[PDB]
Each structure stands twice: as structure tokens, then as C-alpha cells.
């Protein structure tokens, strides 16, 4: 019935969301590394001053 | 993604050219001083 | 000339403190390519 | 009974996960602006040799 079907769809959302969390965390990590790289680049340029 | 990354290294040796020539030119000014401090 | 032959090391610690910058910034670029 | 309750459990677990996602989406967007910004700084540091 309606409660079974809902549970079915929700079980799916959960799986989707759990996977989405791990992917967004990896992505954050990759972005923070991109930031660090360039944050260092700036301190170098920032001394030729 | 944004801007220039190695065009960075392009105006970074171009900052090691317009400062390293700051003290080579802060040396020909000493040509009149190692010897001017002599007369 | 001697407090001066740092006229090279004070620029030399500038001339390549700005070398702290890129081989620790090549550490976050190949960690990207891992 | 067991079904009603499980349906409740699932509904919370989805809300909870939506918030983790939402937060991460905001962290990412923030990070994007910081990155755009400091990359703009660097543009100036390298190119305003006009000083």
C-alpha cells in the first residue's frame, strides 16, 4: 500500500543521500587543496612587494 | 576555475627581472662611491 | 660588504623564501592527480 | 506498529541527510567565492607592477 511504497522510496533517497554526502566531502577536500595551492602562490607574489 | 596559473610564472620571473636589476643598478651607483670616497 | 654580505642573504632569504611557495604548492596539485 | 514507526525512522533519516547535504553545498559555494576572491588578489599582486 501507500506506506510500503513510501518506505520503498525513502529507503532509496537515503541511499542516494548517503552517497551524495561522501561525494561532496571528497569534493570539498579537493577544493580545499586547490585553495591551499593558490593561497601559497599569493604569499610568494605578495613578497615581491 | 578562474584566471591564470603559469602565466603566474610568466610575471614572476618578470618580477625577478625588475628587482634583480634593482641591485645591479644599486651597484653601478657604487662605482662612483668605492672610488669617490677615495678623492 | 660584511654586515653587507647579507645584502645577499636578506635578499637570498627573500630571493628564495619565495621557493617555500611552489614545491609545497606542487604538493597540492599532484595530490590532486594523486 | 513496526511499519508506521519504520516510516517515521526513515523520514527523519532523510531529513538528517538533507541537512548534511545542504551544509556541504553551502561549504562548497563559500569555498568557491574565497577561491574566486584570492585568485583575484593574486591577479593584482602579479600584475599591478604599476607599483
Give the span between the Cα atoms of B5 and C29, in whole angstroms. Answer: 12
Give the span between the Cα atoms of D7 and D49, in whole angstroms. Answer: 64
**Residue ranges making up the domain that contains C22:** 1-34
Long-range contacts formed by A20-28: CB under 8 A, 24+ apart:
A20/D17, A20/D21, A21/D17, A21/D20, A21/D21, A21/D24, A24/D21, A24/D24, A24/D25, A24/D28, A25/D24, A27/D28, A28/D24, A28/D27, A28/D28, A28/D31
Whether D40 contacts chain A with CB within 8 A: no
Chain-centroid distance of CA D43 in Å reads: 25
Contact A21 D21 (CB under 8 A): yes
Which cell goes with A8? 520503498
Collapsing DSSP states into helix, strand and coil, what is residue A36?
helix
Q: D2-47 vs A2-45: helix axis angle to the nearest 10?
A: 20
Q: How many CB pairs under 8 A join A and B?
A: 9
What is the 8-class DSSP label of residue C34? -
Phi first, then psi: give them for residue B8, nearest 5 degrees: -70, -55
Give the span between the Cα atoms of A27 and C12, in whole angstroms. Answer: 38
Which cell goes with A17? 543521500
Give the span between the Cα atoms of D10 and A9, in whole angstroms. Answer: 10
User: In Å, how far is D42's CA from the nearest CA of chain A?
Assistant: 5
Cβ atoms of residues A28 and D32 within 8 Å: no
Give the span between the Cα atoms of A23 and A14, in whole angstroms. Answer: 14
- Walk me through the domains of chain D, giving residue ranges and CATH numbers: 1-51 (1.20.5.170)
Give the span between the Cα atoms of A25 and A21, in whole angstroms. Answer: 6
> What is the longest distance spanned by two Cα atoms in chain B?
62
Structural biology method used: X-ray
Residue A44 buriedness (CB in 10 A; 0-12 / 13-18 / 19+): buried
Residue B3, Ramachandran bin (φ over 0: left; ψ between -120 and 50: alpha; else beta): left
Chain-centroid distance of CA D11 in Å reads: 23
Q: Which residue of A has its CA nearest to D1?
A: A3
Long-range contacts formed by C24-30: CB under 8 A, 24+ apart:
C24/A40, C25/A36, C25/A37, C25/A38, C25/A40, C25/A41, C28/A33, C28/A34, C28/A36, C28/A37, C28/A40, C29/A37
Cβ atoms of residues A10 and D7 within 8 Å: yes
Phi first, then psi: give them for residue B35, nearest 5 degrees: -105, -30
Q: Which of C11, C14, C26 to mutate to test the interface with B (most CBs of B within 10 A)?
A: C11
Q: How many CB pairs under 8 A join B and D?
A: 19
| First CA to last CA distance, chain D | 75
Cβ atoms of residues D28 and A31 within 8 Å: yes
Q: Is the Cα dihedral D38, D39, D40, D43 positive or negative?
A: positive
Domain count, chain C: 1
Q: Which of B1, B9, B15, B20 to mutate to test the interface with A (most CBs of A within 10 A)?
A: B15
Residue D42 buriedness (CB in 10 A; 0-12 / 13-18 / 19+): buried
Amino acid at each position: 500500500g501507500e506506506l510500503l511504497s513510501k518506505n520503498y522510496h525513502l529507503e532509496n533517497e537515503v541511499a542516494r543521500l548517503k552517497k551524495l554526502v561522501d561525494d561532496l566531502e571528497d569534493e570539498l577536500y579537493a577544493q580545499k587543496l586547490k585553495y591551499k595551492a593558490i593561497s601559497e602562490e599569493l604569499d610568494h607574489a605578495l613578497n615581491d612587494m | 576555475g578562474a584566471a591564470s596559473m603559469d602565466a603566474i610564472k610568466k610575471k614572476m620571473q618578470m618580477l625577478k627581472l625588475d628587482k634583480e636589476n634593482a641591485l645591479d643598478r644599486a651597484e653601478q651607483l657604487e662605482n662612483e662611491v668605492a672610488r669617490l670616497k677615495k678623492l | 660588504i660584511q654586515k653587507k654580505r647579507q645584502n645577499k642573504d636578506l635578499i637570498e632569504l627573500q630571493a628564495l623564501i619565495d621557493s617555500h611557495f611552489e614545491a609545497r604548492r606542487k604538493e597540492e596539485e599532484e595530490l590532486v592527480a594523486l
